[PDB]
Amino acid sequence: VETFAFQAEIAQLMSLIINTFYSNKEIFLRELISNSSDALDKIRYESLTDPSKLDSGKELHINLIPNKQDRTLTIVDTGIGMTKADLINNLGTIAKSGTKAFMEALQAGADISMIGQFGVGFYSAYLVAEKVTVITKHNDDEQYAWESSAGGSFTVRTDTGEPMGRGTKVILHLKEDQTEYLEERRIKEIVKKHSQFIGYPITLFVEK
Numbered sequence: 180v181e182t183f184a185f186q187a188e189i190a191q192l193m194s195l196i197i198n199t200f201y202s203n204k205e206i207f208l209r210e211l212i213s214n215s216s217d218a219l220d221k222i223r224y225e226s227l228t229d230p231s232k233l234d235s236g237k238e239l240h241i242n243l244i245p246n247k248q249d250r251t252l253t254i255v256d257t258g259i260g261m262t263k264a265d266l267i268n269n270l271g272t273i274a275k276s277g278t279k280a281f282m283e284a285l286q287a288g289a290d291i292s293m294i295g296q297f298g299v300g301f302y303s304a305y306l307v308a309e310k311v312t313v314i315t316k317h318n319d320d321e322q323y324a325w326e327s328s329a330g331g332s333f334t335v336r337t338d339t340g341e342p343m344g345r346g347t348k349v350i351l352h353l354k355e356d357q358t359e360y361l362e363e364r365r366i367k368e369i370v371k372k373h374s375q376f377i378g379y380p381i382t383l384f385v386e387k
């Protein structure tokens with residue numbers, strides 16, 4: 180298990196997201212679904228030039244899986260996935276500028292729901308999650324688990340759990356007071372409001 184410091188700008192953003200009073204937390208789900216959709220767009224595009232990129236799975240979809248026993252909501256996609264370099268360095272490097280602009284825009288009167296316009300919508304997960312785990316598999320690399328409970332650090336390790344084939348799972352370990360996001364009616368409501376036109380099937384799993 181390797182431990183890394185977040186880019187300073189990203190630690191600042193995470194603290195802002197955790198500390199700012201902002202009741203409209205439900206927008207986190209749209210941002211995660213958007214990342215999944217963009218990841219699915221990318222593998223679809225790449226597979227046109229190279230059909231073998233779907234050898235790791237032809238199905239292009241998004242699953243939403245609540246688990247009340249574990250107090251987790253997982254967003255699963257069969258998109259392009261992320262390499263180790265993406266997880267550790269590359270996406271966060273790119274996200275530095277967006278992070279800075281967002282925080283500047285908030286100082287000027289924007290609100291937290293506009294986060295996705297700055298390319299850092301992933302971090303909205305911390306509106307509702309105390310810990311986020313990202314399990315991901317890209318065709319060119321092994322399966323990795325990224326994890327952070329904020330506090331300025333994240334970890335990456337090779338994942339020895341069930342092989343995914345290709346794609347990304349974002350596991351939200353929900354805060355004690357955010358369990359409404361495990362309720363079928365609540366998730367259905369948010370998906371219809373903010374994510375009704377996503378171009379891949381979204382399956383909301385129900386609890387046994």
Ligand SMILES: Cc1c2c(n3c1CCN(C(=O)[C@H](C)N)C[C@@H](C)[C@H](C)Nc1cc-3ccc1C(N)=O)CC(C)(C)CC2=O
Nearest residue numbers: 214215217218258260265266270271274298301313325347
């Ligand atoms: C930024 C950012 C970040 C993450 N994703 C993105 C978002 C980075 N990104 C974009 O902002 C695009 C260019 N608008 C490319 C996406 C789509 C990429 C391939 N897949 C993806 C990425 C993210 C989340 C889910 C998925 C996922 N579910 O696959 C996750 C992590 C690297 C742990 C931290 C972080 O800074």
